[PDB]
Amino acid sequence: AVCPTGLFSNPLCCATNVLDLIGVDCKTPTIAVDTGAIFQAHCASKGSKPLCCVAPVADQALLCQKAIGT
Ligand SMILES: [Mn+2]
Numbered sequence: 001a002v003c004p005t006g007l008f009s010n011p012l013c014c015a016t017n018v019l020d021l022i023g024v025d026c027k028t029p030t031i032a033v034d035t036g037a038i039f040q041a042h043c044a045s046k047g048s049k050p051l052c053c054v055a056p057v058a059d060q061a062l063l064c065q066k067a068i069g070t
Helices: 036-045
Strands: 010-018 022-027 049-053 059-066
Touching: 010 036, 010 059, 022 049, 036 049
Parallel strands: none
Antiparallel strands: 010 022, 010 049, 022 059, 049 059
């Protein structure tokens, strides 16, 4: 379990999670991301939070939800 299906379907590594609703400074993973633990570790290696966002590309600010169990 990486991201849910539907709206919040794209794993990104974002510098900040604002309001539990917005990812700021969002990077694409540079690896395939197979599990929650890999997602978490990969984003932490980039100083970032694993968020599940509405689009799959790098961006300034996106609507996102935290990855599960974070
Ligand atoms: Mn920025």
